[model samples]
Target: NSNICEVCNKWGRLFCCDTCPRSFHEHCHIPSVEANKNPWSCIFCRIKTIQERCPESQSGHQESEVLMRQMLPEEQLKCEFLLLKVYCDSKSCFFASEPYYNREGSQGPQKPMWLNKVKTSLNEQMYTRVEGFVQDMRLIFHNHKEFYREDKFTRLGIQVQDIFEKNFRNIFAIQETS
Candidate 1:
């Protein structure tokens, strides 16, 4: 019968260190353990020694900095609005319908007026772009109904990604690398 390390189950006549509980093959250690040798250091101990001597790793911090730097100004600004729009739209709240009184002293839903003004402004700025964006978003939800499947939060995420991508691409110089 062959001896095996208790930790890794590899054939070796060695046990884990009493302190660290790491095991290694007798020949795998720096100072090979001869038969009946009472004390032996494992591979983990050698790795720990090397780590202590070298500088601490900064890869995680560097990655975070890179992500922060890549965020664009417009993206930072419209992120919350996009989130809110997605949340509202998922609940069949696509049209803003809060009651706002017209110039005349009469109470009525504000959605029609709001949508008309929006359409006019969008048309003046750039015809068909906003309409196309909204249409594409509607199509995405319509086609991927199974994936969304009444899950408002997931649908919200999809809507936000689409609107953000469309608006950012149209009006700004948003770039992944920049």
Candidate 2:
């Protein structure tokens, strides 16, 4: 009975996830959906599976975090998976794509950060530690909050920021270092 595209919040043709209530337009999901995938699971469900199997020491709770030079392959996958979750829950492509609303005579102001760029840095293996991944992710939301104030765009950023915080804690099983 999923009636709307979870990503864009629109109505029309959609692909319902077999494992969850969320649905997406064929192109709305991160990598986009294809007809060949039978009984597809949404990104949230897939990330749940990954978290259950993720090893504990490498899950960002250990004391020797400073020694880890780069995200282990498994951790890298989890980071990417978490980002996809943020993208889906964000409910808008604005954060995932380049800012089309920049303030240069219709070009609009340049965005200092964006989710797509974070994803690129992640896939390029530019982050040396898991914390680097978290920093870049937080920067996306921070930039959004700083640039837009009390607008529809800011509200969307707020939702995604909350979503990212919860998912990051859950997926990494991170403990607050307080």
Candidate 3:
């Protein structure tokens, strides 16, 4: 009748997709859902309704302006990054965007995940900005900071939206368009 965890039944970190009536732990739902991934259908539903996951079609965002070859360089890079996530499509998903433009080799290298997978050549400026955005997301994952006030209903929730908004709003340029 309420937001009950399928795993524990009482109440805890959980989320349910419209695809399935049963809800489990946020990351414990059947196969569960990660923090950020495009069109993350449940494992059960994924097998039935989805399977073909293409970088070009796996944007996870609304199908907005078509990303054409002659689009702005920035837009192209963004699209490329979005596809890179799809290309990775596994454990190496986030790391797929590692920025490796003549950078050093350390424990956690800052190599672009699509360094090798990417066919598009990026200028240093654009590359840095794109890589910076990826880094922010990585930071959010590693730190997993939840700043929202914890209330009765808001318990055991993840701050994915907050983190994404905080990071995206800072790096991305916005304008009031009607």
Candidate 4:
């Protein structure tokens, strides 16, 4: 019923999730939804399903050690969902690809990070723990902002970071201290 896909924000053939307000294009959604399914739930709903089924022992507050430990299947799935959400945001196009090359050769970030790189690392199982993924996402925001400080790109960095952290907090059910 939504006009635009919740993931890509584009108007197209969209699938509405039975459990939420989110709608997504078939290809845009993680696991790629099928057209004929009578009842469909998006990945976020599925994440909630698994989380409720598995119910963390320490409810309401997850400790830092939990993030530092080796990632479990559920953790990996959540990280993947986060990555997909980042990719779906149109603003992410700026960081989704390789940084532009400067012919001057004196400018540009020494250590470049991109959305694709993070996605690759996740798919390749390079992240041993949830903290690793968290670090990588922060690194991307930091690197982009540092490289293009005082510009619109830097502002975009903040916008993207906000989107990420907001969703991250929801997915993890992180409680705010102050």
Candidate No. with top lDDT:
4
| lDDT for position 27 in model 4 | 63
Q: Which 10 successive residues of model 1 have the least lDDT summed?
A: 74-83
Q: For residues 66-138, could you state the per-residue lDDT of candidate 2 as single tens digits?
A: 3253687757766776787776663636677665445432323344667878877876888878778887777
Q: What TM-score does model 2 achieve against the real structure? A: 0.59
What value of lDDT does candidate 3 attain over all alpha carbons?
0.38
Per residue, candidate 4 scores C-alpha lDDT tens digits across 18-126 of: 9988888876776567657778888878887987787772255554854776877788888888888787778988888777645332367667888887877877889
Better of 3 and 4 by TM-score: 4
Tell me the tens digit of each residue's lDDT in model 1 across 1-178: 2255532356656655644665546533323333564564443454345445653421223323323432233222232223233332333243223223333433343222222233233324332233333433444334333334454645654664475455433323233454
Pairs of colliding residues, candidate 1: none
- Candidate 4 achieves a global lDDT of 0.78
Per-candidate total of colliding backbone pairs: 0, 6, 10, 0
**TM-scores, each model vs. reference:** 0.23, 0.59, 0.23, 0.77
lDDT of each: 0.38, 0.70, 0.38, 0.78
The TM-score-based order of candidates, best leading, equals 4, 2, 3, 1
Better by lDDT, candidate 4 or 1:
4
TM-score, candidate 3, is 0.23
What residue pairs are clashing in model 4?
none
C-alpha RMSD for every candidate: 23.2, 5.3, 17.7, 3.3
